Design a protein around this ligand. Structure first.
Ligand code: MG
Ligand code: MG
Ligand code: MG
Ligand code: MG
Ligand code: MG
Ligand code: MG
Ligand code: MG
Ligand code: MG
Ligand code: MG
Ligand code: MG
Ligand code: MG
Ligand code: MG
Ligand code: MG
Ligand code: MG
Ligand code: MG
Ligand code: MG
Ligand code: MG
Ligand code: MG
Ligand code: MG
Ligand code: MG
Ligand code: MG
Ligand code: MG
Lengths: 261, 178, 145
RNA sequence: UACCUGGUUGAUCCUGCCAGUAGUCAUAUGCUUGUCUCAAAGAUUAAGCCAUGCAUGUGCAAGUAUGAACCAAUUUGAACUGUGAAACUGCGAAUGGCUCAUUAAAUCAGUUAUAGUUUGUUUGAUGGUACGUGCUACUCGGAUAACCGUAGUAAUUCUAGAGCUAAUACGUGCAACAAACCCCGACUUCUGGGAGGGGCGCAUUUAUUAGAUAAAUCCGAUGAUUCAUGAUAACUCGACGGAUCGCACGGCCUUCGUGCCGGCGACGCAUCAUUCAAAUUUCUGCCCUAUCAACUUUCGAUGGUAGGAUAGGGGCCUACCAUGGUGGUGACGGGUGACGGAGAAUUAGGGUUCGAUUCCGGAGAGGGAGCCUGAGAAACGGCUAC
RNA sequence: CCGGCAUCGCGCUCCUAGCCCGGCAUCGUUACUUUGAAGAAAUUAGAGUGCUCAAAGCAAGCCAUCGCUCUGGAUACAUUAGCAUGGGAUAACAUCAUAGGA
RNA sequence: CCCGUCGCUCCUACCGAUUGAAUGGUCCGGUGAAGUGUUCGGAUCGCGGCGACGGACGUCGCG
RNA sequence: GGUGAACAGCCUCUGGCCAAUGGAACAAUGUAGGCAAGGGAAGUCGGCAAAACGGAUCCGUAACUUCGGGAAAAGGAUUGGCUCUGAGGACUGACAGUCGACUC
């Protein structure tokens, strides 16, 4: 039409928001922000629909305008903020930290972390290039721009950032054999170790990953995300250690949980 | 207004295209500038998409011309338009337009060329053993005004910038000027 | 000289001919040497596009067009225009009601550089570029006769 | 539930249709109707016409207050203290919503591309020189609404004039080095220089140059670039480089002087990236019609070159040149009681028919056409004309 | 159902490259076929769930049903066009006889 | 059993002089509102330079 | 000779003429030529007479047809002056020199 669309209808909402169908006509319409806004969750979905600390739009407004809800080292009072992958959401009054990760079935969990693994975050880089006066800088998929990059940190790689020094402390070089976890598509959620990476001139680079227990799959580059060097992750995985389990297997889990009680 | 739409054209097969929209702004045009060469220098603001500004140069006399073979770029004053690769009428009515051929003062270039105690003549003798200075441009200095190719977009940026002719381009335009 | 044939002097942008300090081996496109660009994708820049005198701003190798998008193969259907051909993309179509194939086709205008030399009905490989004209969105990258 | 039944005959076996049979998230209507849950409803005809009323306005501690009010009420110094209605300023009104008229490779779907572009905002990073002969900043303008007052008009958020008073409205204008380097350049000693002093932010445009190899001291990206970016010479009557607003006070005297000072924010300028997007754009795909076989092209048709315009590619337009483009694989033309799609009904399978409609995309606001503001409109709950 | 082998396997220098050595680049196209990715939800199929059933909905269930636990909110389909991997049976195109061959 | 002409009633379509008629479109040409851009234009309105002149005047500064 | 498509009309050169009985006046009716407001064939047997159209370039051109035409159908646009630009040639030694009356 004749400008930006400022309403979002619940059915048009991303499928991983889980939100119901007769709940209304409209959805939170996540504001423009630092993350892709189709791969994100508004802090209203973080508060009302997952943690249930409120029960209405206006009560979530009270939550956020109290200045309690602090994201990534700094309080964000916007109620449609596109919080997404490894954004850390802290609450001083509850002294309670959360970190937003994919779970194996393609959705977002809020995994609790203690303070030491909440002092910092971890994100991949979009691309590193020069700027004014020849000073190099790199761009992350969180949008952050970092100047004077370590001369070895390259594109597609991963970098840890503290919230006080607010710069790089270490980086994982995206390469063969380091644990990744896909962040988009049908394979999203599953962690695994890269086992192969083939490139075709002029198209998306394909990443073949193997899970911790035998299964193998493939993914496009924009979706994969190294976590740690080697098999060991540098982040606390959720209750499913990044293994997507077949529906038969997950039926057996619930059957066994039934027959164990 | 003036429109850049592909709607009013035919199709590639040659059939008419029934209209389905009313004209949109983001397919507009604006009427050309026909930048004259005149003393009463006049460049007017136009406010375009994105809110930024373009400089419609209605008429200029003073331009900015480079000399690549010696890498010196001097302000100068335009003399006249003498050749224009699309239309003779544009030469006739003296419109400043990209890839046109104007004539320039040679005053900044002469006074530069005289440039380039013992510290001075030592540097002059270090140079001036490499002067080549083709006769085709030297005779043009002796005539007192140089051919130059305007390379800016005066209706787009509001300037008459350009470069002095040398070499095959000089000699080809020359061989058309007689 | 032959290639300068129009009412303007044809010349390659940002390439400066009559320079003082010139040398035959610095990099092409610099110090008076003709510009060319390896379009890539395994396509090899032709020898006469290297040592060619023609000046052509729509050539993939020597011009200002970048080959990006999708790549097609077709056949030269006619070479009756200036620096352009129409490639016919024969293929087959699936009629789902009938489980059979009907052959459809499409004529595609494609810009050739003067480096290439096409006769009617020559296998060609073309790649997508910026819109050069009303109908031309492709440049010829390979010609197999 | 992958189905048949009555009718040509004196009777028979057929081809064959007629009629029966069942559904419709498919409408109308007729008869009838006690309870619960659910919930389409001026689309088809008239994208015909509209009385009335509403549907888009906005206020924080943080742009502007003794102009007139309310609450505090004064040791009668200063506040306008605190609540602020009106108004200026800023922002939104380009979303929502309604409809399907026009439109049949067009919109639209899947899939690309932008290295061919603009993008208020978000988020993150970022920013010297304003003149002083680059030897540390150099000065503070009235008028304007609301108010008061005098009025025309029959008249409308019609309208002239006087008196007042602000700015984050408007308009000026202080500038943080070594200048790193770049070009001139007195004389010295001869210079390969010392050089004494004279010219140089960031954006805009133009131009030069660099942006590095291969087996017997080279350093970013791409699948692909003269890319990212640097240096240079300039260039602009330069948009810009903060005359803004909040609280909480609180270490310590240099002249003990609200004194040396100092943090946390709000707003705002510009650049890059991100995001919200847009706009173009590649391939393939759409119903019936040959009683629609040639259509396009002087006046843009297809292409080339140069330019103009656009935010940008492009015959989008101009000048010149070439003689091309589509078609029996159905162009062009005509019909459509035709917006496209996700999908709906029916279904053994395959299909047949439908899809105005609440989700996505497009298009319109009586019919056309043209523009202001703005980041965003060819807006119609904006204007101009017929 | 298949890995790898050898037989009368044109070579590979380079990443994947053995405890001299498997499984390495470029130097005919397609279709077909397998697998993979990306694939908007709503609709449909289909898993769980005693809205009392049911159409539905996406909830909700168990603690001593005392200051909280366990949560789910699956999965499929998506023909045609495009991208990518394995095969070469079947089927078209082009074509070693001038050798301008290796 | 049955074919056709003729006579009559009714329905439907056809040809048909009438430069037939109406509605709606499309093209060429004529006229052309209006807006946008442009040239001149200059109603008034801003340091109100200077005459060192008595709130005034002309030279007025350019915008 | 000029214009012009032109042995059209109009004007001039060589050659030839001012020969047609003259003076005054400008009344009616005439013969020949024009022009008229508004209307536009009502006039009259009848558009008789007059007016209108008229060259050229570009576009467009119906019914009917013996397929040759109708056709210069009908219906439109342009045309001056002056200053330019472009294209079309000849002779001589893909270029150079010399010349060139015209047409678009
Ligand atoms: Mg809308
Ligand atoms: Mg059946
Ligand atoms: Mg019978
Ligand atoms: Mg019977
Ligand atoms: Mg029936
Ligand atoms: Mg309708
Ligand atoms: Mg209406
Ligand atoms: Mg162009
Ligand atoms: Mg319709
Ligand atoms: Mg809609
Ligand atoms: Mg609209
Ligand atoms: Mg409108
Ligand atoms: Mg309305
Ligand atoms: Mg003549
Ligand atoms: Mg005659
Ligand atoms: Mg008359
Ligand atoms: Mg008569
Ligand atoms: Mg009569
Ligand atoms: Mg009579
Ligand atoms: Mg009569
Ligand atoms: Mg007559
Ligand atoms: Mg006739």
């Amino acid at each position: 039409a004749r400008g930006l669309k400022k309403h979002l209808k619940r059915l048009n909402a991303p499928s991983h928001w889980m939100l119901d169908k007769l709940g209304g006509a409209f959805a939170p319409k996540p504001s423009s922000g630092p993350h892709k806004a189709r791969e994100c969750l508004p802090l209203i979905l973080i508060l009302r629909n997952r943690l249930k600390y409120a029960l209405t739009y206006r009560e979530v407004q009270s939550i956020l305008m109290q200045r309690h809800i602090m994201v990534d080292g700094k309080v964000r009072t916007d109620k449609t903020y596109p919080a997404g992958f490894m954004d850390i959401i802290s609450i001083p009054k509850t002294g309670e930290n959360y970190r937003l990760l994919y779970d194996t079935k393609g959705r977002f969990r809020l995994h609790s972390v203690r303070d030491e693994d909440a002092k910092f975050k971890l994100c991949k880089v979009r691309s590193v290039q020069f700027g004014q006066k020849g000073i190099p800088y790199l761009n992350t998929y969180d949008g952050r721009t970092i100047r004077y990059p370590d001369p070895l940190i390259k594109a597609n790689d991963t970098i840890k950032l503290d919230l006080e020094t607010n710069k790089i402390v270490d980086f994982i070089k995206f390469d063969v054999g380091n644990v990744v976890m896909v962040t988009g598509g049908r394979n999203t959620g599953r962690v695994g170790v890269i086992k192969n990476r083939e490139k075709h001139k002029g198209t998306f680079e394909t990443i073949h990953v193997e899970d911790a227990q035998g299964h193998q799959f493939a993914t496009r580059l924009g979706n994969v995300f190294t976590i740690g060097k080697g098999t060991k992750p540098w982040v606390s995985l959720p209750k499913g250690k990044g293994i997507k389990l077949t529906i038969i297997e997950e039926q057996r889990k619930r059957d066994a949980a039934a027959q164990a009680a | 207004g003036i429109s850049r739409d592909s709607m009013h054209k035919r199709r590639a097969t040659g059939g008419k295209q029934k209209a389905w929209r009313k004209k949109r702004k983001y397919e507009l045009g604006r009427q050309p500038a026909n930048t004259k060469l005149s003393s009463n220098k006049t460049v007017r603001r136009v406010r375009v998409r994105g809110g930024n500004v373009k400089w419609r140069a209605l008429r200029l006399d003073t331009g900015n011309f480079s000399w690549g073979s010696e890498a010196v770029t001097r302000k100068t004053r335009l003399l006249d338009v003498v050749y224009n690769s699309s239309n003779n009428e544009l030469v006739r009515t003296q419109t400043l337009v990209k890839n046109a051929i104007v004539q320039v003062d040679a005053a900044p270039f002469k006074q530069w060329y005289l440039t380039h105690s013992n510290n001075v003549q030592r540097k002059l003798e270090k140079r001036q053993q490499g002067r080549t200075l083709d006769s085709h441009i030297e005779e043009q200095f002796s005539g007192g005004r140089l051919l130059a190719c305007i390379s800016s977009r005066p209706g787009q940026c509001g300037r008459a910038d350009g470069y002095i002719l040398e070499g095959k381009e000089l000699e080809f335009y020359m061989r058309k000027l007689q | 000289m032959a290639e300068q044939t129009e009412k303007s002097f044809l010349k390659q942008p940002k390439v400066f001919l009559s320079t003082k300090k010139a040398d035959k081996a610095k990099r092409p496109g610099k110090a008076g040497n003709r510009f060319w660009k390896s379009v890539g994708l395994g396509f090899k820049t032709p020898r006469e596009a290297i040592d060619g005198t023609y000046i052509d701003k729509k050539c993939p190798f020597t011009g200002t067009v970048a080959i990006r998008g999708r790549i097609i193969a077709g056949t030269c259907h006619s070479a009756k225009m200036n620096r352009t051909i129409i490639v016919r993309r024969n293929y087959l179509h699936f009629v789902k009601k009938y489980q059979r194939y009907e052959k459809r086709h499409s004529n595609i205008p494609a810009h050739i550089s003067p480096c290439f030399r096409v006769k009617e009905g020559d296998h060609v490989i073309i790649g997508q570029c910026r819109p050069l004209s009303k109908t031309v969105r492709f440049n010829v990258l390979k010609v197999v006769p």
